[PDB]
Amino acid sequence: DYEKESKRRKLEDEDFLKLKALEFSKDIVNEKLQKIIVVTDGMKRLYEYCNCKNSLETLPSAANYGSLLKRLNLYNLDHIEMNVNFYELLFPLTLYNDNDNSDKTLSHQLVNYIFLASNYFQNCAKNFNYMRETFNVFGPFKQIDFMVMFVIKFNFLCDMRNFAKLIDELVPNKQPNMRIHSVLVMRDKIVKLAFSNLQFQTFSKKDKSRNTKHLQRLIMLMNANYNVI
């Protein structure tokens, strides 16, 4: 018979529910890092390719990857791009803004790791012909550009595996930090600009090379597309 009171009470209770549901944005688990760990560990176990004894501070040395390159010649690598989805690659990291500040070392370690990746990719772009020469030493390969890009991104993936092996205990969050996001955005700008000013001799391998599931998973993860699992 009456009106208003129902609507007013419902609106008030919904307002209280909204102010409570604000706090619902906390997350309980991440998946991107889990995919990273899964793919890295699977490839390492399947092919022992984790000759993981090198840091990102310098370019990888062909002395540690000659047989790796020889094996890589077996597969086809036309699916692999040339540039890097740096923003996409490092997006999972920003999610770990701990509530208040559990330990300030977390944020600074994140910043330091981001800048380390920045310098690593800058050096990789800077010494591109150097790597072309070093990997032509062991013998020419039709997909030499694919091999170089894959080697660089695989070294980076192994290093990121080791780095993030130390943080997965913590809790992610749906809302990434603003500061970390801005740093990542500007660094992605820098990296993409550095890579876009080059020329690459892409090769098409029309032979039906053997398709390894771990290889294709690693390829898709490298280009940071997480539609793999």
Binding site: E12, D15, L19, K174, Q175
Partner: protein, 346 residues
């Protein structure tokens, strides 16, 4: 400004966050549900607060930063019947219409949407945020352009410092301010706040807010007793305080006004604080019985001609009284006499 007839607008204070539950597909004349959903946002920052998993109904979701377009007029918006479209707090004229309905959920009601349809979700018992200034507390600054980051702090903490980059255009500043003000009005207890901007810009922002609330009221929104206070009025309040008010109360303006509310009625006159707080637009008050305030006016208006002023307005009487007071006091100048002429009716 003449809004197209396909737009549906919902306005509510609690739209600072995206309202996932309310988004639904639309059907064109083809009578086929469209599952490709496209969304727009003011700045790329808001993209980081739209879950791609909060839309189980829809097959695919594409997000874009709403960047103003010039090649298409608002009179005849472009039609893309291949995807539903839903806007969020738009700040420039809408230019793209999806199939069938096109909802626009916003917390700000500018001129561009005024002539569209409307469904306001009004609010109950809003809290009034408290404005003050430091001249003893742990000030907690907040990123105004992205308030969604500091939601927990806003819920919990008390002091807050509005902070704006110089990049932000006026419109985005207004939108962020409205977001934070709605957050406060939904808060469980009043929160203290200040702005780190030049005073003139603060006045411009408050004028914008006043006109926004005027439009909201003209579309039927429930009135809110919480509103900003003009800076000149603030200076008057500070002078009154310094004259007699020793401390700095949280709602000292409300304190003054209620301290005179206690006397408005029995003496039947406006407290001069209200008068100075306000050409024409003369204010009054009421009781359940029929009587005005300023002269004890009848409910109609200022009477046109009630009685002559022969005994007063004549220069002889005013001069005689002036000479009498001057002689009695020993003055030579500095005293002015005015006839009692503002006598509407006893």
């Amino acid at each position: 400004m003449e809004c197209p007839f396909q737009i549906q607008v919902c306005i509510s204070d609690r739209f600072f966050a995206f309202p996932h539950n309310l988004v639904e597909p639309q059907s064109d004349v083809g009578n086929k549900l469209i599952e490709n959903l496209i969304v727009y946002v003011p700045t790329d920052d808001d993209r980081l607060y739209i879950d791609k998993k909060q839309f189980p109904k829809f097959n695919s979701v594409l997000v874009y930063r709403h960047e103003h377009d010039v090649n298409i007029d608002s009179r005849s918006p472009k039609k893309t019947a291949s995807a539903t479209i839903v806007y969020w707090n738009p700040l420039v004229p809408i230019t793209e219409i999806g199939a069938g309905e096109t909802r626009v959920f916003s917390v700000l009601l500018t001129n561009n949407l005024f002539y569209c349809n409307t469904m306001i979700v009004h609010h109950e018992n809003p809290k009034c945020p408290i404005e003050f200034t430091y001249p003893k507390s742990n000030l907690r600054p907040i990123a105004c352009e992205i308030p969604l980051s500091h939601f927990k702090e806003l819920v919990e903490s008390n002091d807050f410092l509005l902070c704006f980059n110089l990049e932000t255009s006026t419109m985005v500043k207004i939108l962020s301010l409205k977001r934070i003000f709605c957050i406060f009005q939904y808060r469980k207890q009043p929160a203290r706040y200040v702005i780190n901007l030049p005073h003139e810009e603060i006045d411009n922002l408050y004028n914008k807010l006043n006109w926004e609330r005027t439009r909201r009221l003209m579309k039927g929104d429930v009135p809110s007793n919480c509103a900003t206070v003009n800076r000149s009025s603030l200076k008057y309040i500070k002078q009154a305080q310094s004259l007699l008010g020793i401390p700095d109360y949280s709602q000292t303006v409300v304190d003054f006004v209620k301290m005179f509310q206690k006397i408005i009625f029995p003496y039947q006159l406006v407290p001069n604080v209200i008068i100075k707080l306000n050409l024409f637009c003369k204010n009054d008050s009421i009781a359940i019985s029929s009587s005005g305030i300023v002269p004890i006016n009848m409910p109609d208006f200022s009477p046109p001609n009630t009685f002559d002023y022969s005994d007063y307005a004549n220069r002889t009487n005013i001069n005689f009284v002036t000479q009498r007071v001057l002689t009695d006091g020993g003055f030579s100048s500095g005293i002015t006499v005015t006839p009692v002429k503002y006598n509407y009716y006893l």
